[PDB]
From a paper:
[name] ([name]) catalyzes the fourth of five steps in the coenzyme A biosynthetic pathway, reversibly transferring an adenylyl group from ATP onto 4′-phosphopantetheine to yield dephospho-coenzyme A and pyrophosphate. Dephospho-coenzyme A synthesis by [name] is believed to be the rate-limiting step in CoA biosynthesis. The crystal structure of Bp [name] features a Rossmann fold, which is known to bind di­nucleotides as well as GTP and ATP.
From a protein sample concentrated in the presence of ATP, we solved a 2.1 Å resolution crystal structure of Bp [name]. This structure had clear evidence but weak electron density for de­phospho-coenzyme A in the active site, indicating that dephospho-coenzyme A was only partially occupied. Refinement with the occupancy of dephospho-coenzyme A set to 0.5 (i.e. 50%) resulted in crystallographic B factors that were in line with those of the surrounding protein atoms (∼30 Å2). One copy of Bp [name] was observed in the asymmetric unit, indicating that the other five copies that comprise the biologically active homohexamer are crystallo­graphically equivalent.
Numbering used by the authors:
A (entry chain A), B (entry chain A), C (entry chain A), D (entry chain A), E (entry chain A), F (entry chain A): 0 to 91, 95 to 161
The structure:
Amino acid sequence: SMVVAVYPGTFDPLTRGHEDLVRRASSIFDTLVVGVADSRAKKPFFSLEERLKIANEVLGHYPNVKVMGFTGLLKDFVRANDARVIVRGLRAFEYEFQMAGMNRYLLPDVETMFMTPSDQYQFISGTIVREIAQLGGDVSKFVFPSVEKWLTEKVAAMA
Amino acid sequence: SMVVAVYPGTFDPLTRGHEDLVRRASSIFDTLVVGVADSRAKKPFFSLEERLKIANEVLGHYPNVKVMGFTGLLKDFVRANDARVIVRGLRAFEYEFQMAGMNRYLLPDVETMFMTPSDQYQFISGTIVREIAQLGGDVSKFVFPSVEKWLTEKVAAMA
Amino acid sequence: SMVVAVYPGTFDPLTRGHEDLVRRASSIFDTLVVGVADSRAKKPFFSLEERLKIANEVLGHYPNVKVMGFTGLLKDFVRANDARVIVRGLRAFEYEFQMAGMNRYLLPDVETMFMTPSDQYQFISGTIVREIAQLGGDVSKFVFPSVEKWLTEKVAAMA
Amino acid sequence: SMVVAVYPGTFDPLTRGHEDLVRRASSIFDTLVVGVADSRAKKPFFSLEERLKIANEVLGHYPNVKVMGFTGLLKDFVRANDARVIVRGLRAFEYEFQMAGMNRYLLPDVETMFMTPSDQYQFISGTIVREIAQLGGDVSKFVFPSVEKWLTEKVAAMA
Amino acid sequence: SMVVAVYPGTFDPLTRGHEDLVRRASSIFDTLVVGVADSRAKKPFFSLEERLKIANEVLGHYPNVKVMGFTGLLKDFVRANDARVIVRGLRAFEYEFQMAGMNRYLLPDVETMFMTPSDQYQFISGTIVREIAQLGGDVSKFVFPSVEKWLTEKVAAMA
Amino acid sequence: SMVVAVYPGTFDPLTRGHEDLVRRASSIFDTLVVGVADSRAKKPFFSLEERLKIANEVLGHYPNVKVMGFTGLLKDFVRANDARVIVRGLRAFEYEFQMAGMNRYLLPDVETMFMTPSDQYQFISGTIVREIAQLGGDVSKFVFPSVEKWLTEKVAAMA
Ligand SMILES: CC(C)(COP(=O)(O)OP(=O)(O)OC[C@H]1O[C@@H](n2cnc3c(N)ncnc32)[C@H](O)[C@@H]1O)[C@@H](O)C(=O)NCCC(=O)NCCS
Ligand SMILES: CC(C)(COP(=O)(O)OP(=O)(O)OC[C@H]1O[C@@H](n2cnc3c(N)ncnc32)[C@H](O)[C@@H]1O)[C@@H](O)C(=O)NCCC(=O)NCCS
Ligand SMILES: CC(C)(COP(=O)(O)OP(=O)(O)OC[C@H]1O[C@@H](n2cnc3c(N)ncnc32)[C@H](O)[C@@H]1O)[C@@H](O)C(=O)NCCC(=O)NCCS
Ligand SMILES: CC(C)(COP(=O)(O)OP(=O)(O)OC[C@H]1O[C@@H](n2cnc3c(N)ncnc32)[C@H](O)[C@@H]1O)[C@@H](O)C(=O)NCCC(=O)NCCS
Ligand SMILES: CC(C)(COP(=O)(O)OP(=O)(O)OC[C@H]1O[C@@H](n2cnc3c(N)ncnc32)[C@H](O)[C@@H]1O)[C@@H](O)C(=O)NCCC(=O)NCCS
Ligand SMILES: CC(C)(COP(=O)(O)OP(=O)(O)OC[C@H]1O[C@@H](n2cnc3c(N)ncnc32)[C@H](O)[C@@H]1O)[C@@H](O)C(=O)NCCC(=O)NCCS
């Protein structure tokens, strides 16, 4: 059979933890669609278009990975992609179970499947990544060199 | 004896999960006062007056339920209502135990009693409800038809 | 109205934390029935009869508190006592939510209400109490003097 | 592609919660192998052979589900089945993350994927199921009629 | 040996819970540096300078306690103080483990050590403290009299 | 100043996670006493004497680490060692906070300090280690070669 899985997120920016999940999920499912949510309410540091370019630079080499943005409901993005799985990361839960439970009513034949990144990525926080970068600290332990470049450029252009 | 219980919350808007707690709590206590907190700091989607009308439309049929707003301290609302119980919902906790623990010093003879909604309401998040509704998605699985109407009207009037 | 609440537990032995919950719950409900579960599978340190005497010595002075044992299903003990509330303690949950959720199917009109003991009793563990007492350490910070006597006698009679 | 997933567990007995996970997982993966672990150390109420018959009676109608026992390491059962996924249930975690984390070292190309059962099965505990059944209470809300029969027979034969 | 420990935080304002940790940590380590983080992003109620004065008024009597502000990276504040320990409070964790885990990469020879305040301070929330004070409620159960004065003055000057 | 810290545990057997905590704690405190608890009630796989030899083989090279057994109360072992700190590991808590909270009453001037092992050891479970070893699986990812030898010998001698 052919199974498409969606991995949605704000990805502000894509971290080594997100990337590791992408590697892992994409070896299981036929197609893995990385869905970059507009996330207007969260006031993301990078624009949607920047977040797509960031993610594409890191992920473009995976042959069965598509990176796409969405501005609307996850329901509509999942159906559009003929997807029967939503992948989400769990690190060692409030939000995730609510989201999954509500998606059981909104997308009744879609399965949310929780995956866990490698040990070394378990403790990466996006908020802490952005904060460190905005204070001029390097986050190359947490994001790829291409992403660090984007962070440096945006912080410099902000100040 | 006569026991009045207060069930306070932002209720932005009242969900089927809140409503289920109201049903359950009001069959135990003589009077159940639903206290709608102004919650100015949270920047609620609906105004206090709208949140009261919303809640009254859903709850008015329960004979021992009162719906009232408050703009001040919970302590003052609880005393005003001669209440010896504060009801709060727990779903499967940081905030709730802090709030209860601090209320043990502020309201020493008042008992916080935690109740849990039916299975089907365990995963409803208010934040997700508002977000879905603001993106034009229906939330009738999570709120009553009267509440969906309010949501549709406010989203239309916002845009 | 008249509301009877059951507070069930193994109580091996009744701690200051259990006692504090009893005080608190019994000021709210008309009758509070402390239900001592036989708990055969847990292999309790004290026998059921000893656990009843222990609890009665501590609680007998509360006029609306009954202490009773049960060897069967909680369902049958709750119905017998015309109870519409089960009180359980929460300290800062796996077991408690499963138990409550399963009781929603077994006892559909009964409400489980979770209460939290005073600050100073939040960290008492029964297992640690028994272990300390079995090693000859005093647990008077955690159980009343009458209970310490029972513990000392049983540990001496064991060895 | 062809993806085999293993869903291992003690299954003492298979509950409606396990069954729901099986339904869900087996609509995603090509083959879903239910692995019944011997679990000698847990002293299971039913024997391995009984647990297999129990599970087969409930699951035999699913065309891509295999029910098999294993007495050895999960590693060996997973490899035997050419499986690249281990499915595990999460309800609203200590054990599960340890198990998954240790399996990342033991089975480096195998992905543990956590799934969550429908709302109505979120609160079923196996321990509580067995305890109720051993006290003569019906657990038909928690296990299928075929499983209730097995429970009744074993409890009667124990006493 | 000589061991300096840093206890960093927003301290908006210093509570009795923070103060208790300071007392406890400073009896173990030779020097305890209380690091007041600028925390611009959190939009703190008090300015950095106010938060330093607040903390100094309460803590100045401890002979081996230094109170200092920092506007940059924790890494730079920790190195500046020749510190090999970061002290953090735990009450009965998401943020704290991420922060500690990320600090293992940023400060590889520095140990994060988690301490827990006395029972009576376990449930104090800073957010609730500020909210109560902004509504005109007294928080003397949660902060020292000197801190209550600062809160009263700032709330009066805000309105 | 001179500060002795105790790190107590069952250590059945000492894992790479325990060892990492020992390394970390012993670079901070002047003396680190590893206290091997008899733990009779837990029915440990190795005897106390075996657990001491196991731990000494791994830890003997650390100059400020002492490995000692204790059969009585932790209180008595801590006082004997003039210790003002108890070190405990946290991985990403019920037991640990109860233990610490009860120790606040039993050892009022002693501080429990929680430390967290490196990323790669966060998911090691002792129970899973023993179970794997008893089924004939290698646990060299989780324990040092010297410990694997002990495990192999004991499993062979059991069967
Ligand atoms: C954006 C959505 C999907 C939420 O994703 P989120 O903002 O949490 O993405 P984020 O970039 O934070 O992370 C992406 C995923 O990886 C996980 N993750 C975070 N850090 C790590 C790490 N170090 N390792 C592994 N995984 C991680 C996150 O938990 C999440 O599962 C949600 O807002 C959404 O779908 N909204 C769209 C509109 C809608 O329909 N809303 C209703 C949702 S029910
Ligand atoms: C508004 C208060 C009470 C907090 O309530 P909150 O904003 O969390 O209300 P909310 O609408 O989110 O929910 C109401 C209650 O139902 C619970 N709940 C939420 N979702 C669900 C669900 N699906 N099912 C059942 N219960 C639920 C909430 O946990 C809460 O217990 C608090 O801010 C307050 O009392 N402030 C007033 C001023 C004051 O004195 N502050 C000090 C407080 S100690
Ligand atoms: C005995 C029952 C009720 C479980 O109770 P338990 O053994 O956990 O009792 P225990 O003595 O440990 O504690 C009693 C209550 O006080 C709570 N508690 C424990 N410590 C403290 C403390 N320091 N402060 C406050 N509360 C506390 C416990 O969480 C529990 O809520 C359960 O086994 C039962 O009801 N079985 C009877 C047969 C049956 O029908 N089984 C099905 C149950 S759904
Ligand atoms: C048996 C194993 C897999 C553990 O499974 P466990 O005993 O927890 O199975 P159990 O019957 O309890 O449940 C099966 C699965 O469904 C989950 N589950 C439990 N209740 C529910 C419910 N109501 N709804 C959904 N899922 C549920 C469980 O969490 C588990 O994921 C483990 O012991 C094992 O694999 N051992 C074999 C030897 C080995 O290699 N050991 C090392 C393991 S790393
Ligand atoms: C300010 C920092 C340290 C986070 O601290 P935080 O804002 O949580 O401080 P806060 O005042 O809330 O509390 C201080 C400490 O005491 C703890 N605490 C809170 N309440 C209590 C209580 N009642 N009892 C005991 N401890 C408590 C907090 O958990 C925290 O450990 C963090 O933002 C930081 O270090 N930033 C600086 C720049 C940087 O390098 N960022 C990267 C961090 S990895
Ligand atoms: C033995 C004691 C200390 C409890 O220790 P425990 O049995 O949990 O030890 P264990 O070997 O499991 O682990 C030792 C420590 O390292 C931690 N740890 C476990 N795994 C890991 C890991 N992978 N990485 C880091 N730390 C870990 C444990 O949480 C514990 O903190 C306790 O029983 C005790 O002190 N009893 C003695 C008598 C007494 O006075 N009892 C009262 C106690 S209040």
